[PDB]
Design a protein around this nucleic acid. Structure first.
Ligand code: TE9
Ligand code: TE9
Ligand code: CL
Ligand code: CL
Ligand code: K
Ligand code: K
Ligand code: K
Ligand code: K
Ligand code: K
Ligand code: K
Ligand code: K
Ligand code: K
Ligand code: MG
Ligand code: MG
Ligand code: MG
Ligand code: MG
Lengths: 723, 723
DNA sequence: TGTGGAT
DNA sequence: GGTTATCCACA
DNA sequence: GTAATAC
DNA sequence: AACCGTATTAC
């Protein structure tokens, strides 16, 4: 039992019986509770189903998921498939109406297309369509509720019953009671299915192969040609009852949805702040709840739950793991999260679960969020429109290069290594002064990656290649040294190992060399590392060739590796392969937007204030007259009107005056107000200049970047060699 | 298979090596990272370890946990045990410094006492002792590393720089980095151990048996005699270095701590609101965050995380399960939580995890929390003194009987069944009017339990026994009926089953009767239930004695069971076996406290306001003088002083006047103020009367209880017979 | 054997 | 997301 | 055969 | 709390 368990129908009836294939055991539960057991069976699917186009045939029939699905249908597969031996008249695929749901449908259809074709062409495979929306009228036991799949139906409901009704946007099947699920999706009389058909065998074949086959480039090409990254889509105005659709159209619509989503909004970083959406949300949410470096740590489970509740509609598993990674300093050059407890190690042993650990933002993460409160960055509504979230962070340092990013999307992947903050900033500052700067010059400031794990990087020519094209291959090699021993014996001591390499497996792989005697002369392998340093010790036998051994180990173990740059990121909504120049130029452009926006915000504040202060200065000279005036008025409105009519204060000033507390009349110091007036006028001038002159703005940009480097700069860790 | 895995020391050295036995794999991780691997081994323990006194040797060595612990020490067990074959000189037990930690230590010591005695008396078992406190990582720029085990040591640390920098209270090992853990508790040079010794074999034997043996009554007696339920404790001035302690004293100190905690603060309900701490926290936290019945549902994971982060220092597993239970209407007579999604069923299939579901408080749960904002109920500080939490809820209905409670503590257990709200309130109302009311009379209003699952309760005489003494045994029997069929055949149709019985297992157990043919004449068993009703059908064969079958099924399946009342609850911090009379009288006494407290609160508001209004009325008559006065003052303080000195306003009035907005000086309408003054005086009179006359107060109490009954009353579900 | 808050 | 253990009391 | 967000 | 599967890309 690696596969979900079948809950059968009460009877045997191939004419009528239906097999529901449900996304996840939990919804499988609800389905089992909500069904009509006389003729409806339930088989839950455990997450993502094997790609039957990519994988072998051997392996496909080692997949318990598949075998229990074959068995259950009771008609074998492929070669011998007999439709008259089927146990159900209908196979209904029921997933969340979200992207990952779309992906599962895709994966299943390419199973049935490739191994149970007669079933598909006989019109016996369907997609169940859960509702997207629920409208609720009153409260308590006077609730009242209806459902809607399109935006047009939803608009029709706003009349039907409105005048204070509210709306739930379903994010999955997991938010539905079994009776809700029956009424909308499982009841023959009221459900809405789509019947999958094959209109053209040729077009369907080609369509399945391009989207699901092991060849990446056709699929990428397809994505570039079909998905509009820049735009929105509009949902299929579903027809109540059955609706036919071609396998071709389904596969295209579904895979398109999924591709786009996991490109834009999962696996690939934004070119400006170098964050994936999950990471952005972790930081924003934590920041918003004041979980910052200067304040107490806060239980990880709390942070995670708020992230999941307010921003990120996905498993806690994913969120926590991401948050953990941001805290591991052997993975990030500048950690964005501090976390008390067991957050793993280089040995790759599992971190404590969120119930154990506690966490806060690091100091430098502060700087990613700097000036977010000042309308510096575009915000969007979250999934249930309760709350706005940033689409990108201000990013007062260029985090994409500094911490890098690895990911795997559809049609694209990324591997950007980390860099030294100070070097990166030196580069950015040069580029601010020299927009057309080329790679050779930039590489005087930014010579290459700087891994948190240190070690030796070799391959100047390929570093340059990578910085030009986004791709290159470099060599990363462990830092070693020899120690003499009693007996006329040596030992090799490793003190730094290559990025992304699991220490405990490295040590094991090395000891396999000894055990199998692949190279002569290894006495014993011992991991001697501790909380104060990395130290692997390879004790050699008496007079064995130290250099023969060390060379063998570099060659045939991960004591030395190749790192491959594949620098891909999201620029204007679309994925893009990019070198240093696009990266740095995008960052600069972004900081420009931030600073301008910041300065417009701060200037409006100072303006509004100065206008008040100008009025208060006047008031003082006529204080008694103003009191008499207010006293002689009828009410708040009347008083303001008289202040305007009689002394030409503005509405804004009049409001300020009239809302002053009585005790203010004691303090009547004009010069302190005049000093404030002065400093405001100065402040507005500085800010106006920035808005009004690109050079002034860019000089500020550079000033701030240097302040950051000054504060956070650290020595390089990885040494660079040329060959 | 099932037990934690040993991470060994680099070398073999029985003279020096140490085996750390660690509470949980996660802390096992930290320990493994923090240790000095040359001589320190690590074996994690997975939660609670088998009680080697209660369970009998055989099952004890089918316990993988124990076998891998025997194996690891390498000296066999029992009478074989050879100390010179041990692999370590020291066996160090390292748990959280919390109650469940204490419990683990207990369980382990009774293993080593009973099966490895020479090891204990050779002074080779130890307890690890992690710190309770830390003087802030958020204390400027850190450089603080300051830890403390007692309150006295903590007071000594308060004389460190930053004159008011902060304190972390460690709740477990999970909040410590591996280097923190080394420095405080694993490093020979700086750790503080307790060395376990046997000072008196006889006293130790007796002490272990009473606390750990299968006999409950000696243990209860021990608890009654030793645990001070109404007191605080005080820790040992621990000695830097080793400190010796007798097995006897350790077992007593540790088990005492655990017993007390799981009696008062885990498994047993409070007699007034009928809640366990976890349940109270769920409701308080959810209410505080406005997650109420009239507002939209909110992701379960979010709720849980906030509960865990602010109030309840225990696993999410426990919290969520408790929250789920509060939503299942076949477990609670009046559900306190509404939950969208798969929250289980009577078939006992597993609920969806908190990442799937969403939830809010039910309408009636509102009434448990009613007037919490009004200082009606004692609050305590939470574990990290950031926030106060209620020790009991106001409880505007008598939830203990209405929903009941089942639990298992140490020395005590509880089983209180649910009751019909209307009946319960009728009883309470009678008792308000008739304090000395006896059971016979009360049972005219409250005749017995009312299970949410319905069915038939038999045994009036035992119900009465239970209502007098707190114990009784009743019979709960499924609701059945016969249906005639075609071939001169009958079938038994069950429509309601007994409380706490899993339907799907019942159906299975019944079908096993058929399959094994234990009794003749069963044709087929069919669960025909659906989301609209429960319906099991037992089709009988032609001429089989349907009464012989039905009787066999009542006897030998859970189609009929015995329910045992064991009504135990917490009254003045101590556990107490109680009938209806203590229960109802405690509730009434509680509502009295609430209403008095409520009325004192509301009256203080009205008082403070009336005093303000009296002052404002005066001001108007002397408005010009008051302005001149303020104008002639120096500052806010000075103005108030002059208002007091010159016009005998109070501080409270003076503050109000001086903080008025200028536009208030328009108004000279005394009438509207006078009407408010009038209403306030009236309101205070009503409230004063309640505080000042028991009768008035109790009539209110009764009024409110009737309002509640009127609103929430539901027909009885369980029918009552006498057997 | 199995209830429900705990590890 | 299911599977697998223990504690505790009481029939 | 492995990285990291997802189911 | 560990153990167990999958998708997606590029060496
Ligand atoms: N039943 C279902 N489980 C999963 N699922 C979720 C995991 C997670 O949230 O981190 C996970 O780590 C995980 C590991 C597994 F090994 C795994 N396996 C299927 C078993 O046969 C092995 C599955 Cl399935 C896993 C799912 F995403 C959806 C499910 F319905
Ligand atoms: N490794 C550890 N696990 C647990 N633990 C925790 C559970 C929970 O928080 O809900 C749980 O449901 C659970 C079930 C188990 F079956 C179980 N088993 C021990 C295995 O051999 C089977 C264990 Cl251990 C369990 C622990 F509380 C502490 C741990 F270190
Ligand atoms: Cl087609
Ligand atoms: Cl002793
Ligand atoms: K068949
Ligand atoms: K850590
Ligand atoms: K190599
Ligand atoms: K003011
Ligand atoms: K539900
Ligand atoms: K029975
Ligand atoms: K005012
Ligand atoms: K007026
Ligand atoms: Mg989903
Ligand atoms: Mg996982
Ligand atoms: Mg603990
Ligand atoms: Mg569990």
């Amino acid at each position: 039992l690696l596969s979900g368990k079948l809950t059968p129908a009460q009877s045997k009836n191939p004419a009528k019986n239906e097999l529901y294939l449900v996304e996840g055991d939990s919804a499988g539960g609800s389905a089992k509770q909500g069904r009509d057991r006389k003729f409806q069976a339930i088989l839950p699917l455990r997450g993502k189903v094997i790609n039957t186009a990519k994988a072998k045939m051997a392996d496909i029939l080692k997949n318990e998921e598949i075998n229990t699905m074959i068995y259950t249908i009771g008609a074998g597969v492929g070669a011998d498939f007999s439709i008259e031996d089927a146990n159900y008249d209908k196979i209904i695929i029921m997933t969340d109406a979200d992207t990952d749901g779309a992906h599962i449908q895709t994966l299943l259809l390419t199973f049935f297309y490739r191994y149970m074709r007669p079933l598909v062409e006989a019109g016996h495979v369907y997609i169940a369509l859960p509702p997207l929306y629920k409208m609720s009228k009153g409260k308590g036991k006077k609730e009242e509720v209806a459902y809607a799949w399109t935006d047009g139906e939803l608009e029709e409901l706003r009349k039907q019953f409105g005048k204070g009704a509210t709306l739930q946007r379903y994010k999955g099947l997991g938010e539905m009671n079994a009776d809700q699920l029956w009424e909308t999706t499982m009841n023959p009389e009221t459900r809405t299915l789509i019947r999958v058909t094959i209109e053209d065998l040729a077009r369907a074949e080609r369509r399945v192969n391009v989207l699901m086959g092991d060849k990446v480039e056709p699929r990428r090409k397809w994505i570039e040609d079909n998905v509009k990254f820049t735009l929105e889509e509009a949902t299929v105005f579903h027809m109540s009852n059955i609706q036919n659709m071609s396998l071709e159209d389904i596969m295209g619509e579904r895979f398109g949805r999924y591709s786009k989503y996991i490109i834009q909004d999962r696996a690939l970083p934004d070119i400006r702040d170098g964050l994936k959406p999950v990471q952005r949300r972790i930081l924003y949410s934590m920041n918003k709840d004041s979980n910052t470096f200067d304040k107490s740590y806060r239980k990880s489970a709390k942070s995670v739950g708020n992230i999941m509740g307010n921003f990120h509609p996905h498993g806690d598993s994913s969120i926590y793991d991401a948050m953990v990674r941001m805290s591991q300093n052997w993975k990030n050059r500048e950690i964005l999260v501090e976390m008390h407890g067991n957050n793993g190690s280089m040995d790759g042993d599992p971190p404590a679960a969120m119930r154990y650990t506690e966490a806060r933002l690091s100091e430098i993460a502060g700087y990613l969020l700097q000036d977010i409160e000042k309308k510096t960055v575009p915000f969007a509504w979250n999934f249930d429109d309760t709350e706005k979230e940033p689409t990108v962070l201000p990013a007062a340092f260029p985090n994409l290069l500094v911490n890098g990013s690895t990911g795997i999307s559809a049609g694209y992947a990324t591997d950007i290594p980390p860099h030294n903050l100070a070097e990166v900033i030196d580069a950015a500052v040069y580029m601010i002064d020299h927009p057309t700067a080329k790679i050779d010059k930039l590489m005087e400031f930014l010579p290459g990656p700087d891994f948190p794990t240190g070690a030796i990087i070799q391959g100047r020519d390929e570093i340059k290649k990578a910085y030009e094209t986004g791709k290159g291959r470099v060599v990363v090699r462990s830092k070693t040294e020899i120690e003499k021993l009693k007996g006329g014996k040596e030992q090799i001591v490793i003190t730094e190992i290559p990025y992304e390499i699991n220490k405990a497996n490295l040590v094991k792989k090395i000891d396999d060399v000894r055990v199998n005697n692949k190279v002569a002369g290894i006495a014993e392998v011992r991991d001697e590392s501790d909380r104060d340093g990395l130290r692997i010790a390879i004790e050699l036998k008496k007079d064995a060739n130290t250099e023969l051994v060390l060379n063998y180990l570099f060659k045939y173990t991960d004591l030395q590796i190749n790192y491959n740059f594949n620098m891909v990121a999201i620029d204007n909504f679309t994925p893009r392969q990019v070198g240093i120049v696009p990266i740095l130029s995008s960052y600069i452009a972004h900081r420009r937007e931030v600073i301008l926006a910041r300065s417009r915000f701060d200037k409006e504040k100072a303006e509004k204030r100065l206008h008040i202060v100008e009025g208060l200065i006047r008031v003082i000279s006529i204080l008694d007259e103003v009191i008499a005036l207010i006293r002689a008025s009828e009410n708040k409105a009347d008083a303001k009107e008289n202040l305007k009519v009689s002394y030409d204060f503005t509405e804004e000033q009049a409001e300020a005056i009239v809302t002053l507390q009585l005790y203010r009349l004691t303090n009547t110091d004009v010069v302190v107000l005049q000093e404030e007036e002065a400093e405001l006028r100065e402040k507005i001038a500085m800010l106006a200049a920035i808005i009004g002159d690109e050079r002034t703005m860019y000089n500020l940009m550079k000033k701030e970047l240097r302040e950051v480097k000054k504060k956070f700069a650290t020595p390089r860790l990885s040494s660079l060699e040329d060959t």
